[PDB]
Design a protein around this nucleic acid. Structure first.
Lengths: 84, 63, 136, 25, 99, 215, 64, 126
RNA sequence: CGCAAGACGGACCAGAGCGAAAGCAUUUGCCAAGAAUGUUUUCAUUAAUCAAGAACGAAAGUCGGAGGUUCGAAGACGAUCAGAUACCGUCGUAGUUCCGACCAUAAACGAUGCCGACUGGCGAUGCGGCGGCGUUAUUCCCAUGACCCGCCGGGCAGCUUCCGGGAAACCAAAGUCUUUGGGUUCCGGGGGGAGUAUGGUUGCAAAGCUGAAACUUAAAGGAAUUGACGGAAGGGCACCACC
């Protein structure tokens, strides 16, 4: 920090670097995504930090496994974020 | 040390072959053909290479 | 005397145990199993005052006395085992250790392999001298 | 260690004074 | 007044550390206050090696090393000249002596 | 005893190794010749010899030591059999150094023959060739996973073999090389050895099996 | 029991030793096998290329 | 013993050489006569010591520079390493290669078009 | 060469980890507990600091059982010396180890209460998460382990600077103080007599906790400077020193 940097207009690379609670206004790092699998093809919605072992509407035994951070998908056809 | 004389490479490879393991009978003979200590030609390099190429043929290890 | 009846072109081996500390040194030669003794000589047999028993000179004189008795009984080569006191104590060899080894070489015995044999605990009973140590 | 010894000297004097007075009555 | 920032010991983030008994006098001191020295040497001296190589039975043999680890208290390390006292600014240097 | 020249009463005997080793003559040894109620063979039996592998095999390896026992005496020959193996003091002192993890394991096992053996194994972590960090420590669960793999491989090789095939594995030490291959998926290892073997119990004397190891 | 006299030639002077500086410390090379060498302590004045008489050859001494 | 020369000898010898370099040489017996006519020296024994160190300094000045002494003959060849050397008739030419991130830095500065290019290693050298 | 018993866990072992502190290191299994991190889960002010009261608390010590390898208060002797009831040596009781009750102290120390906010720079290190070009291992990819380059939490520490402070030594807190007020607990008032006398109280005992006055005195004490001195260290010198 120099003597004169203005605090009202952080650049997006200054804001994306810092902790979620310490930004100028708060925002989560997590997201919603839509997920699809082989053998049965009814698309479903998942949260990227899931704690549940998700079962799809296609009745496959595991869609994803839980983990200490992001959940990992069982080689499913999509990891696509929803926009909003 | 690693080998004190290059003759004792064959006297090692013959022991892995007596135990019935061919992979560790190579690697011994590979480094002894590929170490600067034994680069001067000697009568024992023929028996070394004649055992080495038999194992490369039998394991089909062309490289 | 009588060694083995073979006496040309090949060696007859013994084992020499050298125990060298402060206070004294032992030179002791045995059969290859260790069970039969051939001869044993010590620093305190060579000098006539207690200060000198651990000395380089007494250890040289003990080694020369042993090597003559080996050749007289037909042994020609030695394996060597070296000790310091060990256990709770210092486990560095005493000052007479180096002199005995060269003196049996210079007096004509052939030399085989050599080993360090001092006893080491994985952990031990309480050492002598109290919490404040020996103070001087 | 003079202070630790002055502490020991007082404890043995107090043990004497204890036994002397509590004998009287 | 305080002489050293570390109190003359390695202990930070701990209550108790086990003692050891010294190799000279058997005084009792903490494992992290004790002054360390690990010595590696030949069994045969640099003068004696030639006399013992020529009487050897083998065409090739290499004489073995002796390994010993030593522990001292402050009084033995100073009296046996393992460590010296230093100038007030020189006490801060943590790098070992040159070779 | 204060005998005048007791070395006048001693007979030299030869000592012979098992038929696996490429050089079969150990050396020569003393005993007092027979007297009433004290026979020479009773003094020769049960003696232990400790020999470098380079003197059984005429290489330079030098750092493995094998222990042999006398069992019977035939003419002027003492006949020997296997009793254990060990590493020389200066080898083990050269491996244990700072900034590494040291891993050890042990097992009790029987051969297809009646012998009961106890084995000890050691391994050390490897500094990777790009590493700029100073220390190569494994975490406690990686150490536990490696120790189970040391015991798993070390028991597999003894249960389905006789003492003849066990000693043929210990001469080159193929046991330690197989452990070193298997663990590289958990944490890389750089020195790996079966460092000691002890014998706990053994079957009846069986002269026919003794001579099968000598003919 | 007995051992013979040996002669040896001074090849270098190394310094002075003893409580009062009384003894010179010196390197010597033997008159029989010229490949051999040892170090010794000498009582008098000594110069390079002097020949000493040794009553024992097998003893060797460092800094008294 | 001790033959070290004091500052009265060493300073007088330097001042003589700065003023009279063209008179002096390697012969002590001629230097001893020159130093007697260019200077007032109170003692014969001091005159001999000054001419001695002057004779030592002349034999050094014939090999290279002495940091406390200066002469025209040595300054004008310093002035010939000063100015321009005989080494080259033109500069080291500007035709030099560029790394991809310097190419991008020059692109944002509206420049380039005269340099060859190649990439570095896959990961940071260890 | 072989047998038996009791104590202890070397090297790896580090300004490294865990615990409220005291403390905690051979293997494997069983029981209950916990910090940090991840989270677009849930309750909705439930919190901070604490008279009375309560749990834990090194070593030594006391009472009742079992064991006894090593070491060793008291004690018996050998040396040293003017003496040596000591330092040094040989032997050895209680104790040192386990089980069940007591005891409540320590240079129990970071000689530095706890909670919250703000004020410079730099390289490392242990744990969890996030991103990335290569090398290496297992199966043929993918996933995942060992290494390498960055980022974010919260942790034990280090170097540096005219932040600022202080009597200074020194301290990124021991700073944001005559430009003096974020909350709250314990507690000091010149040196001695004295942690003593006396009363109460807890304890089997040893002892712990609480705790005066008469009288006496001009200094006692902290940090730093220049000398002199050392049965402290490193260089150099002298026939009023020595060989």
């Amino acid at each position: 920090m120099p003597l004169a940097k203005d605090l009202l207009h952080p650049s997006p690379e200054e804001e994306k670097r810092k902790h979620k609670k310490k930004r100028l206004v708060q925002s989560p790092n997590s997201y919603f995504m839509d997920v699809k699998c082989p053998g049965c093809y009814k698309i479903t919605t998942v949260f990227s930090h899931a704690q549940t072992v998700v079962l799809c509407v296609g009745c496959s035994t595991v869609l994803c496994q839980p983990t200490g951070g992001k959940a990992r998908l069982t080689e499913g056809c999509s990891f696509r974020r929803k926009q909003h | 040390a690693y080998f004190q004389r290059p003759e004792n490479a064959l006297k090692r490879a013959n022991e892995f072959l007596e135990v019935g393991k061919k992979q560790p009978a190579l690697d011994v003979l590979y480094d002894v053909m590929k170490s600067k200590k034994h680069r001067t030609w000697q009568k024992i390099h023929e028996p070394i290479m004649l055992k080495y190429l038999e194992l490369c043929v039998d394991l089909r290890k062309s490289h | 005397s009588l060694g083995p009846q073979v006496a040309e072109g090949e060696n007859v081996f013994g084992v020499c145990h050298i125990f060298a500390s402060f206070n004294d040194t032992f030179v002791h030669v045995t059969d290859l199993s260790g069970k039969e003794t051939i001869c044993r000589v010590t620093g305190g047999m060579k000098v006539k005052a207690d200060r000198d028993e651990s000395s380089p000179y007494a250890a040289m004189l003990a080694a020369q006395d042993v090597a003559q008795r080996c050749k007289e009984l037909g042994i020609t080569a030695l394996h060597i085992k070296l000790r310091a006191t060990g256990g709770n104590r210092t486990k560095t060899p005493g000052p007479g250790a180096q002199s005995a080894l060269r003196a049996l070489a210079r007096s004509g015995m052939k030399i085989g392999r050599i080993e360090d044999v001092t006893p080491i605990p994985s952990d031990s009973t309480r050492r002598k001298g109290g919490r404040r140590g020996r103070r001087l | 260690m003079r202070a630790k010894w002055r502490k020991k000297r007082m404890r043995r004097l107090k043990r004497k004074r204890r036994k002397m007075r509590q004998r009287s009555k | 007044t305080k002489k050293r920032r570390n109190n003359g010991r390695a202990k930070k983030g701990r209550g108790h550390v086990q003692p050891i008994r010294c190799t000279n006098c058997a005084c009792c001191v903490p494992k992290d206050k004790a002054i360390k020295k690990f010595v590696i040497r030949n069994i045969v001296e640099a003068a004696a090696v030639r006399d013992i190589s020529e009487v050897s039975v083998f065409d090739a043999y290499v004489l073995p090393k002796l390994y010993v680890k030593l522990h001292y208290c402050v009084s033995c390390a100073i009296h046996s000249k393992v460590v010296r006292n230093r100038s007030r600014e020189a006490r801060k240097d943590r790098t070992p002596p040159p070779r | 005893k204060k005998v005048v020249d007791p070395f006048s009463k001693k007979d030299w005997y030869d000592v012979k190794a098992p038929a696996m080793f490429n050089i079969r003559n150990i050396g020569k040894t003393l005993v007092t010749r027979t007297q009433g109620t004290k026979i020479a063979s009773d003094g020769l039996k049960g003696r232990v010899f400790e020999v470098s592998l380079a003197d059984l095999q005429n290489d330079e390896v030098a750092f493995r030591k094998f222990k042999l026992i006398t069992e019977d005496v035939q003419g002027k020959n003492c006949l020997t059999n296997f009793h254990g193996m060990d590493l020389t003091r200066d080898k083990m002192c050269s491996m244990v150094k700072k900034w590494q993890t040291m891993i050890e394991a042990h097992v009790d096992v029987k051969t297809t023959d009646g012998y009961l053996l106890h084995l000890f194994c050691v391994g050390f972590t490897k500094k990777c060739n790009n590493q700029i960090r100073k220390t190569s420590y494994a975490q406690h669960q990686q150490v536990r996973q490696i120790r189970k793999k040391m015991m798993e491989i070390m028991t597999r090789e003894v249960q389905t073999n006789d003492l003849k095939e066990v000693v043929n594995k210990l001469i080159p030490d193929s046991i330690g090389k197989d452990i070193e291959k298997a663990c590289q998926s958990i944490y890389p290892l750089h020195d790996v050895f079966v460092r000691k073997v002890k014998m706990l119990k053994k079957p009846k004397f069986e002269l026919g099996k003794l001579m099968e190891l000598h003919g | 029991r007995v051992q013979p006299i040996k002669l040896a030639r001074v090849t270098k002077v190394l310094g002075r030793t003893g409580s009062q500086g009384q003894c010179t410390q010196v390197r010597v090379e033997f008159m029989d096998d010229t490949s051999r060498s040892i170090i010794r302590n000498v009582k008098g004045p000594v110069r390079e290329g002097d020949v000493l008489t040794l009553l024992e050859s097998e003893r060797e001494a460092r800094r008294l | 013993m001790g033959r070290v020369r004091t500052k009265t000898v060493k300073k007088a010898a330097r001042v003589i050489i700065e003023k009279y370099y063209t008179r002096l040489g390697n012969d002590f017996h001629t230097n001893k006569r020159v130093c007697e006519e260019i200077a007032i020296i109170p003692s014969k024994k001091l005159r001999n010591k000054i001419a001695g160190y002057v004779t030592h300094l002349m034999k050094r000045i014939q090999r290279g520079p002495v940091r406390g002494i200066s002469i025209k003959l040595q300054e004008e060849e310093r002035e010939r390493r000063d100015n321009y050397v005989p080494e080259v008739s033109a500069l080291d030419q500007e035709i030099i290669e560029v790394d991809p991130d310097t190419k991008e830095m020059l692109k944002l500065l509206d420049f380039g078009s005269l340099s060859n290019l190649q990439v570095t290693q896959p990961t940071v050298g260890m």
